[PDB]
Design a binder for this molecule. Sequence first.
Ligand SMILES: CC(C)(C)c1cc(NC(=O)Nc2ccccc2)n(-c2cccc(N)c2)n1
Ligand SMILES: CC(C)(C)c1cc(NC(=O)Nc2ccccc2)n(-c2cccc(N)c2)n1
Length: 261
Amino acid sequence: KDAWEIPRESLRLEVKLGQGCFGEVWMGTWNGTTRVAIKTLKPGTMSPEAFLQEAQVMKKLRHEKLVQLYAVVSEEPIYIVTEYMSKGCLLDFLKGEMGKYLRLPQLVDMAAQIASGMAYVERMNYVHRDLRAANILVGENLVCKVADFGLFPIKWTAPEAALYGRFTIKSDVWSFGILLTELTTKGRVPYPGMVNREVLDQVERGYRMPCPPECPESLHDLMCQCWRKDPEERPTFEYLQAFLEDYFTSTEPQYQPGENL
Ligand SMILES: CC(C)(C)c1cc(NC(=O)Nc2ccccc2)n(-c2cccc(N)c2)n1
Ligand SMILES: CC(C)(C)c1cc(NC(=O)Nc2ccccc2)n(-c2cccc(N)c2)n1
C-alpha cells in the first residue's frame, strides 16, 4: 500500500512483448504521456506477495545501468511498471538486423555499461545469479541496462554455483565473462556443440572457450581472468568496469576495424 501505486486507467497496454506461465509483459503508456514496460500476473500461478517480491527488490536498487521500477498496481489485476527499453533483449539485438554493424568499439562499450550496472550491484552487496545477454535490455543510442525476466542456465553459471550453490558477486563475474562471449560472437550460444553435461565435466578439468574469431587476445584474456577456478582470483566489477571504459587507449589503442569485429 505504497507511494508507487497508480490509478489503473492511467495505463494503456498496447503491444505484447512476451508471455510466460506466470504472466505477460506489455509495452504501453502511463499517464497518457509516457512509454512503459508492464509486467503481468496470471492469477493463481503464484501468490500476490511472491509476485510483488520483484517490486520490493527493485525498490532498493536504483542506478542508471539497472532497469528502473516506475510503479505498481497492488491488487488484481496486479502490475509491475518499469521504464521502457525500445530495443529489447541484448541477445535478440545481437542476433538480428543490428548484428551485422556492431563492432568491437560498440560491443566493448555495451560491456562497460553492464559492468557499471554490476559494479553498483557489487557495492550494494547483492548478487544477480543470472547475468547473461538475455537479461540485458537495450535502449536508444546503444544504452544497456541490467534486468531480470525471472527464469537452469548452466552454460553461464560459475561451477561452484552450479554444483554447490555458492552464488556470489564472483559467480556473477564468471557469468560476465560468458556474456563477453555473446557480445563478441554476436549472440551465439557459448560452448557451441556441447550439451550441459559435456560443459560441466570439461570446465571442471580446466577447459575454457578459445579466443573468438577476430577478437583481441587482451579481451579473451579478460574472459579467462573472469573464469579462474578459484572464485576469489576473479576481478571485481569496478576493475572490469575501468578496464572496459579505458580499453581503447590503455590496452588495444592500435585496434583497426576488421570484417566482423
Ligand atoms: C517474462 C515473459 C513475460 C515470459 C517475457 C517478456 C519478454 N520480453 C520482454 O519483457 N521484453 C521487453 C521488456 C521491456 C522493454 C522491452 C522489451 N520475454 C521475452 C521474449 C523474447 C525474448 C526474450 N529474451 C524475452 N519474455
Ligand atoms: C537487476 C535487478 C535490478 C536486481 C532486477 C530487476 C528485476 N526485474 C526486472 O528486470 N523486471 C522486469 C524486466 C523486464 C520487463 C519487466 C520487468 N529484478 C527482479 C527482482 C526480483 C524478481 C525478478 N523476477 C526480477 N531484479
